[PDB]
Amino acid sequence: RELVLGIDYGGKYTGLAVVDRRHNQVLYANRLKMRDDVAGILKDRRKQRGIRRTAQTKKKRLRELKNYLKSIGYNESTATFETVYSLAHKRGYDYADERKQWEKEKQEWEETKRNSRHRKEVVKDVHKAMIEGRATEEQIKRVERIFNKQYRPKRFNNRILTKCKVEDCGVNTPLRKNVRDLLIENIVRFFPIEQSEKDNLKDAVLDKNRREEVKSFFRKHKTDEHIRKQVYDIADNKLSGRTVFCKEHILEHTEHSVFRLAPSLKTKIENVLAVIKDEILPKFTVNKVVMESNNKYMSHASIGWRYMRDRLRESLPIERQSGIYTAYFRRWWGFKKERGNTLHHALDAVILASRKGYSLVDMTLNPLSYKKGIITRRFMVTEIECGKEDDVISETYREKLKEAFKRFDKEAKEAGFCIKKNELVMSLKCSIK
RNA sequence: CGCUUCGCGUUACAGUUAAGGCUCUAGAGCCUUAAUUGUAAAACGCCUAUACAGUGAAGGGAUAUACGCUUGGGUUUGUCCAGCCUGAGCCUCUAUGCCGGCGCCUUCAUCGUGGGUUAGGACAU
Ligand SMILES: [Zn+2]
């Protein structure tokens, strides 16, 4: 009995099916929803880790400055100590601190810039502080090595690590800005020009400030706009992330032959395997046809596909059907493909595990306050949500808040809630229920 | 998946200022709410003492070194991991921070007591 389990893996939903290949009977067919909340949770972890390690570095800098200043005779009371210890909590940026994310971060930088200073300002301020406090010059020079000190090393050059795709080498892929010579040529191999012209284009695009010859060639030669964009991405050194798999396999990857993967992808695959282990109990599948996508003559094995095959063998022929046959037998057996349809995923899993014939008669079936016994935490006017405006303890600003959220239904500056030193939004105490 | 500060915000304490009042007899005190200044905390825990930071000097720095490879250790638990930190030869793969000046290797004095991780993915319960 050829019980073949077919798994169609989308970016969000996943279809599972088990098709007895005699008479193309279907013994199991199901859909499953994958966890899409893991990347945001990891982003929350990254933000929390950055906050905690910034606080820890602040503690280390404060302890070091306190120890040094008490060593050179500047006790806590010293008017020369309090000024320097006050500027230690606010040392400022040392000029060392897709479009939506850029726009978003750009605003917070300006937000930080509108209410902070440059390292040089806090430093010239500790200068004037210790130049009238009789600190000679060496001691002021030694507190500049505490203000302008990095405690945890900033190591970001070789962190995002990707292995190769061809599966017989899992070596470290280089960054896109290191193997540009192997990158640009990967474009020009599929070009209808002479090899000498290929080398001339290599020399022109590969920096050397010779983009005018690149533009002249591109005006002269008929070349696609996406290839135009890729070449100009190579030439302008705007490349980000690692290269598309290792150097010896950039130019040759037409032959076939995984502990590292995205943890969101890993937990999606494990959820699918959790459902698979609920298929495994009552069905012994002798073969597995899997096509893992987003939504022969195929491309290389996907990292999620490879991890899925390895974990399926751990929990056996596990093949990957081409998209041509699956797409053909799909619409030809009725209906078409819909992105985000769970039924479509289930029926693609049914088709994937089915024994194909040829010429339609086979496929059957933040801390809080605890004063006076009542909880009252402070929330900014931006952080106060509608419906819960009555929890504000401040009766002086309660009417003002509700009126602004009704009369006016930037708005805070219009409503006059930017009353601070740097015109920041004020915060009100709200009674937590 | 990740490094890193700049902040913002929260809580706790100690002050100051501005309103809106309760009590004593124009004044005094404290009640709330805003703003402002200063300090501290932001996991608990686990693991470091053979570890970690500072100080000054000789040493290497594209035939150093490691964020790179192999194998461990901490986090690490009921169990396995991810990430981060790190030991040890490793240099095959990964690559270079800054304008000799950063990191690194020992070394006295190290009096020091400091350091890493920290609620995320699965199974069982
Ligand atoms: Zn390769």
PDB file of C-alpha atoms in Angstrom, chain A residues 89-193:
ATOM      1  CA  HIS A  89      23.990  59.922  33.645  1.00  0.00           C
ATOM      2  CA  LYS A  90      23.633  61.958  30.412  1.00  0.00           C
ATOM      3  CA  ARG A  91      26.789  61.629  28.309  1.00  0.00           C
ATOM      4  CA  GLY A  92      25.168  62.078  24.895  1.00  0.00           C
ATOM      5  CA  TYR A  93      25.835  60.509  21.492  1.00  0.00           C
ATOM      6  CA  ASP A  94      29.416  60.249  20.126  1.00  0.00           C
ATOM      7  CA  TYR A  95      28.341  60.604  16.441  1.00  0.00           C
ATOM      8  CA  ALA A  96      28.308  56.772  16.613  1.00  0.00           C
ATOM      9  CA  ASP A  97      24.640  56.295  17.633  1.00  0.00           C
ATOM     10  CA  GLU A  98      12.110  48.761   4.095  1.00  0.00           C
ATOM     11  CA  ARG A  99      11.570  52.518   3.914  1.00  0.00           C
ATOM     12  CA  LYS A 100       9.016  52.421   6.749  1.00  0.00           C
ATOM     13  CA  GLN A 101      11.594  51.003   9.176  1.00  0.00           C
ATOM     14  CA  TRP A 102      14.142  53.633   8.107  1.00  0.00           C
ATOM     15  CA  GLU A 103      11.531  56.415   8.436  1.00  0.00           C
ATOM     16  CA  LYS A 104      10.453  55.012  11.859  1.00  0.00           C
ATOM     17  CA  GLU A 105      14.023  54.834  13.301  1.00  0.00           C
ATOM     18  CA  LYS A 106      14.943  58.231  11.723  1.00  0.00           C
ATOM     19  CA  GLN A 107      12.167  59.893  13.799  1.00  0.00           C
ATOM     20  CA  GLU A 108      13.359  58.343  17.119  1.00  0.00           C
ATOM     21  CA  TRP A 109      16.934  59.501  16.329  1.00  0.00           C
ATOM     22  CA  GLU A 110      15.659  63.080  15.805  1.00  0.00           C
ATOM     23  CA  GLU A 111      13.480  62.615  18.945  1.00  0.00           C
ATOM     24  CA  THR A 112      16.693  61.659  20.807  1.00  0.00           C
ATOM     25  CA  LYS A 113      18.531  64.493  19.105  1.00  0.00           C
ATOM     26  CA  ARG A 114      15.962  67.109  20.143  1.00  0.00           C
ATOM     27  CA  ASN A 115      16.457  66.317  23.854  1.00  0.00           C
ATOM     28  CA  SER A 116      20.090  65.165  24.096  1.00  0.00           C
ATOM     29  CA  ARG A 117      23.553  66.529  23.337  1.00  0.00           C
ATOM     30  CA  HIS A 118      26.708  65.323  21.508  1.00  0.00           C
ATOM     31  CA  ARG A 119      29.434  63.565  23.581  1.00  0.00           C
ATOM     32  CA  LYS A 120      31.511  66.770  23.126  1.00  0.00           C
ATOM     33  CA  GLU A 121      28.922  68.920  25.014  1.00  0.00           C
ATOM     34  CA  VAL A 122      28.779  66.732  28.188  1.00  0.00           C
ATOM     35  CA  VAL A 123      32.625  66.472  27.928  1.00  0.00           C
ATOM     36  CA  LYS A 124      33.286  70.243  27.591  1.00  0.00           C
ATOM     37  CA  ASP A 125      30.838  70.538  30.547  1.00  0.00           C
ATOM     38  CA  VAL A 126      32.934  68.122  32.703  1.00  0.00           C
ATOM     39  CA  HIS A 127      35.935  70.222  31.541  1.00  0.00           C
ATOM     40  CA  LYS A 128      34.461  73.481  32.864  1.00  0.00           C
ATOM     41  CA  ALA A 129      33.336  71.491  35.920  1.00  0.00           C
ATOM     42  CA  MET A 130      36.848  70.241  36.744  1.00  0.00           C
ATOM     43  CA  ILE A 131      38.752  73.266  35.408  1.00  0.00           C
ATOM     44  CA  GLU A 132      37.367  75.333  38.303  1.00  0.00           C
ATOM     45  CA  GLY A 133      37.498  72.428  40.773  1.00  0.00           C
ATOM     46  CA  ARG A 134      41.336  72.134  40.839  1.00  0.00           C
ATOM     47  CA  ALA A 135      41.623  68.777  39.077  1.00  0.00           C
ATOM     48  CA  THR A 136      44.944  69.546  37.252  1.00  0.00           C
ATOM     49  CA  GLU A 137      44.810  68.068  33.712  1.00  0.00           C
ATOM     50  CA  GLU A 138      45.609  64.345  34.098  1.00  0.00           C
ATOM     51  CA  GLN A 139      42.549  63.705  36.282  1.00  0.00           C
ATOM     52  CA  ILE A 140      40.231  65.392  33.768  1.00  0.00           C
ATOM     53  CA  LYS A 141      41.930  63.329  31.050  1.00  0.00           C
ATOM     54  CA  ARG A 142      41.262  60.122  33.012  1.00  0.00           C
ATOM     55  CA  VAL A 143      37.535  60.887  33.348  1.00  0.00           C
ATOM     56  CA  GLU A 144      37.394  61.338  29.572  1.00  0.00           C
ATOM     57  CA  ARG A 145      38.423  57.670  29.321  1.00  0.00           C
ATOM     58  CA  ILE A 146      35.350  56.794  31.406  1.00  0.00           C
ATOM     59  CA  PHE A 147      32.832  58.979  29.574  1.00  0.00           C
ATOM     60  CA  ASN A 148      34.162  57.901  26.157  1.00  0.00           C
ATOM     61  CA  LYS A 149      34.540  54.242  27.155  1.00  0.00           C
ATOM     62  CA  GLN A 150      32.782  51.238  25.594  1.00  0.00           C
ATOM     63  CA  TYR A 151      32.212  48.523  28.187  1.00  0.00           C
ATOM     64  CA  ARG A 152      30.648  45.684  26.225  1.00  0.00           C
ATOM     65  CA  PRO A 153      32.502  45.331  22.894  1.00  0.00           C
ATOM     66  CA  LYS A 154      30.636  46.408  19.764  1.00  0.00           C
ATOM     67  CA  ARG A 155      30.988  43.325  17.554  1.00  0.00           C
ATOM     68  CA  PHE A 156      28.673  43.372  14.531  1.00  0.00           C
ATOM     69  CA  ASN A 157      30.869  42.594  11.504  1.00  0.00           C
ATOM     70  CA  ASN A 158      30.404  38.788  11.429  1.00  0.00           C
ATOM     71  CA  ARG A 159      27.159  38.190  13.336  1.00  0.00           C
ATOM     72  CA  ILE A 160      24.495  37.464  10.698  1.00  0.00           C
ATOM     73  CA  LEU A 161      25.763  34.067   9.529  1.00  0.00           C
ATOM     74  CA  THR A 162      24.271  32.147   6.598  1.00  0.00           C
ATOM     75  CA  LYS A 163      25.510  28.794   5.343  1.00  0.00           C
ATOM     76  CA  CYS A 164      25.553  27.643   1.714  1.00  0.00           C
ATOM     77  CA  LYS A 165      22.550  26.268  -0.166  1.00  0.00           C
ATOM     78  CA  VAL A 166      24.072  23.438  -2.226  1.00  0.00           C
ATOM     79  CA  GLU A 167      24.174  21.138   0.838  1.00  0.00           C
ATOM     80  CA  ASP A 168      27.543  19.504   0.160  1.00  0.00           C
ATOM     81  CA  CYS A 169      29.299  22.537   1.646  1.00  0.00           C
ATOM     82  CA  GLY A 170      27.812  24.280   4.653  1.00  0.00           C
ATOM     83  CA  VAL A 171      30.624  26.826   4.752  1.00  0.00           C
ATOM     84  CA  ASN A 172      30.253  30.471   5.773  1.00  0.00           C
ATOM     85  CA  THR A 173      28.930  32.638   2.970  1.00  0.00           C
ATOM     86  CA  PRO A 174      30.755  35.961   2.532  1.00  0.00           C
ATOM     87  CA  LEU A 175      29.133  39.345   2.897  1.00  0.00           C
ATOM     88  CA  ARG A 176      27.834  40.986  -0.274  1.00  0.00           C
ATOM     89  CA  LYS A 177      30.319  43.882   0.052  1.00  0.00           C
ATOM     90  CA  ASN A 178      33.331  41.519   0.082  1.00  0.00           C
ATOM     91  CA  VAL A 179      32.645  39.379  -3.008  1.00  0.00           C
ATOM     92  CA  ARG A 180      31.275  42.086  -5.308  1.00  0.00           C
ATOM     93  CA  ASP A 181      33.674  40.862  -8.009  1.00  0.00           C
ATOM     94  CA  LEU A 182      32.019  37.446  -7.796  1.00  0.00           C
ATOM     95  CA  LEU A 183      28.603  39.104  -7.508  1.00  0.00           C
ATOM     96  CA  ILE A 184      28.632  41.494 -10.516  1.00  0.00           C
ATOM     97  CA  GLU A 185      30.065  38.767 -12.782  1.00  0.00           C
ATOM     98  CA  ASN A 186      27.176  36.526 -11.694  1.00  0.00           C
ATOM     99  CA  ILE A 187      25.036  39.136 -13.457  1.00  0.00           C
ATOM    100  CA  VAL A 188      27.189  39.401 -16.592  1.00  0.00           C
ATOM    101  CA  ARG A 189      27.489  35.649 -17.248  1.00  0.00           C
ATOM    102  CA  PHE A 190      23.933  35.738 -18.649  1.00  0.00           C
ATOM    103  CA  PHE A 191      24.687  38.691 -20.929  1.00  0.00           C
ATOM    104  CA  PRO A 192      24.569  38.711 -24.767  1.00  0.00           C
ATOM    105  CA  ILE A 193      27.968  40.427 -25.079  1.00  0.00           C
TER     106      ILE A 193
END
